[PDB]
A paper describes a structure:
However, TgPPase lacked both N- and C-terminal regions and the structure contains residues 74–308, most likely due to proteolysis of N-terminal region during crystallization. In contrast to PfPPase, the active site of TgPPase contained two bound Mg2+ ions. The Mg2+ was bound to protein in M2 site predominantly through water molecules and Asp195. However, no electron density for either Pi or PPi was observed in the TgPPase active site despite addition of PPi during crystallization. Therefore, it is feasible that the observed conformation in the active site represents a state where both Pis have already dissociated. Like PfPPase, TgPPase also formed dimers in solution and in the crystal. Two TgPPase subunits buried 1780 Å2 (50%) of total ASA and are held together mainly by a network hydrogen bonds and Van der Waal forces.
Family I PPases are Mg2+ dependent enzymes known to exist as homo-hexamers in prokaryotes and dimers in eukaryotes. We report structural and biochemical characterization of these two apicomplexan PPases.
Residue numbers in the entry:
A (entry chain B): 74 to 305
B (entry chain A): 74 to 308
Write the structure that this text describes.
Amino acid sequence: VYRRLVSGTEGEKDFRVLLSKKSGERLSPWHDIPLFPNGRDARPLLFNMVVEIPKNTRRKMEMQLRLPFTPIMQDLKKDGSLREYASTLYWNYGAFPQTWEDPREPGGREVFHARGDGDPLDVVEIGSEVLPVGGVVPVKVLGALAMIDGGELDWKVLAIREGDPLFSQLNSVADVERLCRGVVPGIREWFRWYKLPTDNVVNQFGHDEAALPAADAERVVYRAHEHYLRLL
Amino acid sequence: VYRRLVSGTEGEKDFRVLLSKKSGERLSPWHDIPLFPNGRDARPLLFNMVVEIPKNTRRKMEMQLRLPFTPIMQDLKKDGSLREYASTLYWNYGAFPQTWEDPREPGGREVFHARGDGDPLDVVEIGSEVLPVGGVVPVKVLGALAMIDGGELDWKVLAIREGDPLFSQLNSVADVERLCRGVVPGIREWFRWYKLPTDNVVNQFGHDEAALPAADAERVVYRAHEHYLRLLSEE
Ligand SMILES: [Mg+2]
Ligand SMILES: [Mg+2]
Ligand SMILES: [Mg+2]
Ligand SMILES: [Mg+2]
């Protein structure tokens, strides 16, 4: 469905992934990829996921929202070096197109009244297959962890790629805990601890650290989608 | 108190940490450091921990058991390049002196009948302060996770450094869960997942993934201590 135009070498400053339709026409993975690849009336409801960080990698790849067509490149520190996480991420990681965590909207106290992180909504894909930088895959939402990253509400939605062998068997948080041991706590503990070496901070999680159910996590995506639509 | 003799350059193949008494006499952190710094009858019971990997680092530093005085150096790949873990370890990590997880000794059915890892018993220290490579600190044992790494039983004993502010307040897993949220699951999930990028394997845990209580973890250390001592025995 979407074409990856890869340039440079993956570990260097010239690396960049650009997206185009199969017509050849360039398009933004954030603006012009539909959030619902088969409409809002599909059941099970599928969301598009733009993969930024592949499973088993450590480079902080992200869509460059300032640039035309929002290409994916590695984040830079102010020292101008390519930025990496202190630990390898064990799952495909990215964001939902056409979503925005509006900082102007305050959460209840289940999330310590934290505010939107200001970025496209983050999603963790738990499938076995390694997905490439700039990949776009339809996913089924399974749940969501409400991370609090320095006073900011930073949702991590959990999803499973359509076509993964266990897709039809995973429909809720309990199914993941049952058929994929360590995935839910591994993701929670990864994002709780990953900024200890860089910032000496241990993050918190709202809703008593629980993974909110799939239906509630779908509503989180909807709200971020409308915040995005309201932005335009 | 033991003296650290640091040699080579950090992060390079020549880096090496050796231990000596305050006499200057060199000694092996595995062979010549007592497991019980105040004897087995000390209350609270203290075990000595040889710190190999400091909190918030990822180089795979380990005691080199083949070398004289068993110095701590960075592990090597078959390529001969320096080996690092794929992820940063968020806690001080090392081993108990005079312990050996004797293989050939079969585990119960709670550990999938897995055998010993063949190495000195591993310990995770959960205190806040970063400890140096080659540091020797007395710790109080709080619990143990029974990680299974490819048919090998690889215990991760959890302990707290004497002198850490929460020392007197931490005596078992339940205290850690109460006063240090995320420490026990953070350690379990770290060792469950850390070899996925290198080996494409997700580790398992015996005893239904539970953190065994402090008393059970004390017995884990004792048994490994006896395995080591048996290697030294006559007749
Ligand atoms: Mg993001
Ligand atoms: Mg976010
Ligand atoms: Mg070890
Ligand atoms: Mg071991």
